């Protein structure tokens, strides 16, 4: 027989009937062809188990994942990996879009820190993409009054009524005259991708001494943060500078390239988190090496 599966993208939703023997590879390919997306390697189908995200493996049966079996079996089609340079690597317009949406959401949900002024400029572009050029005759007062525009963190740092923000944003919106949709979303991407937290996968760890720290994985390398400060890593290890990383019983070891360097060792208590880090390290490292050829 078959089961139903729900695939949620940032944009939309879709349903599929799947044979009981279907693997990750089968769903993934199906979703990608539907989207007409060829740049598939930034993506993956994720689901959350316990409090940890999980990505469907290609060669395992879908149902052999510890995912809630209550039909429809739901997966989110999200980006697993970020390019080092959006404008250069996101060739297909559909790839651009999906990234844009997913990034804007992380900015509004405050998963990515974003200074007040950047939040405004971003908004003015998010607005241009959704609305097209600004027509003063068409776009009248309060035409943005029901729109998530800025992170809450930003709104309550100022003595400003929502209408004033919307006036600020409109002022910059007007400057984006003549800018096509994909032009705007990419402007958004170009700004957002310089945000210090953009594209960084955080994890709680602690070192040999047992003091609590944060691990950060992204397109550039592995990073170590003081739990209070996520903007600036205390230590960075670029991919080209790492021989490899080893995992062994809730312990990782970053084995640097220069034998000169001391190894870096840290601990994480959750197994599921650990597999995730390991996947993320491998894939980010791969893509990094691929760019360099």
């Amino acid at each position: 027989k078959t089961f139903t599966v729900r695939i949620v993208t940032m944009d939309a939703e879709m349903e599929f009937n799947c044979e009981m023997k279907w693997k990750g590879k089968d769903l993934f390919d199906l979703v990608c062809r539907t989207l007409g997306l060829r740049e598939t390697w930034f993506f993956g189908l994720q689901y959350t188990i316990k409090d940890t995200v999980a990505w469907l493996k290609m060669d395992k049966k879908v149902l052999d994942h510890d995912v809630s079996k209550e039909e429809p079996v739901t997966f989110h089609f999200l980006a697993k990996f970020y390019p080092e340079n959006a404008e250069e690597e996101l060739v297909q317009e559909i790839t651009q879009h999906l990234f844009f949406l997913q990034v804007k959401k992380q900015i509004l949900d405050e998963k990515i820190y974003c200074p007040p002024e950047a939040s405004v400029l971003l908004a003015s572009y998010a607005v241009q993409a959704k609305y097209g050029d600004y027509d003063p005759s068409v776009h009248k007062r309060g035409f943005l009054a029901q729109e998530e525009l800025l992170p809450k963190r930003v709104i309550n740092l100022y003595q400003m009524t929502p209408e004033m923000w919307e006036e600020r944003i409109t002022a910059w919106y007007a400057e984006h005259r003549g800018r096509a949709r994909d032009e705007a979303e990419m402007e958004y991407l170009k700004i957002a991708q310089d945000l210090e937290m953009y594209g960084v996968n955080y994890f709680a760890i602690r070192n040999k001494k047992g003091t609590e720290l944060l691990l950060g994985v992204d397109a550039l390398g592995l990073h170590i943060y003081d739990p209070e400060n996520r903007l600036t890593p205390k230590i960075s290890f670029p991919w080209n500078e790492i021989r490899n990383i080893s995992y062994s019983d809730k312990e990782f070891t970053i084995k640097p390239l220069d034998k000169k360097i001391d190894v870096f060792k840290f601990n994480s208590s959750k197994l599921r988190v650990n597999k995730l880090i390991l996947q993320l390290c491998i894939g980010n490292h791969d893509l990094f090496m691929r760019r360099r050829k």
Partner: peptide, 20 residues
């Protein structure tokens, strides 16, 4: 980068209304 100036102009105009 090329947004330095827009970011600065924006930051400067918000500054008067920042929380005490």
């Amino acid at each position: 980068g090329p947004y330095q100036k827009a970011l600065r102009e924006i930051r400067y105009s918000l500054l008067p209304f920042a929380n005490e």
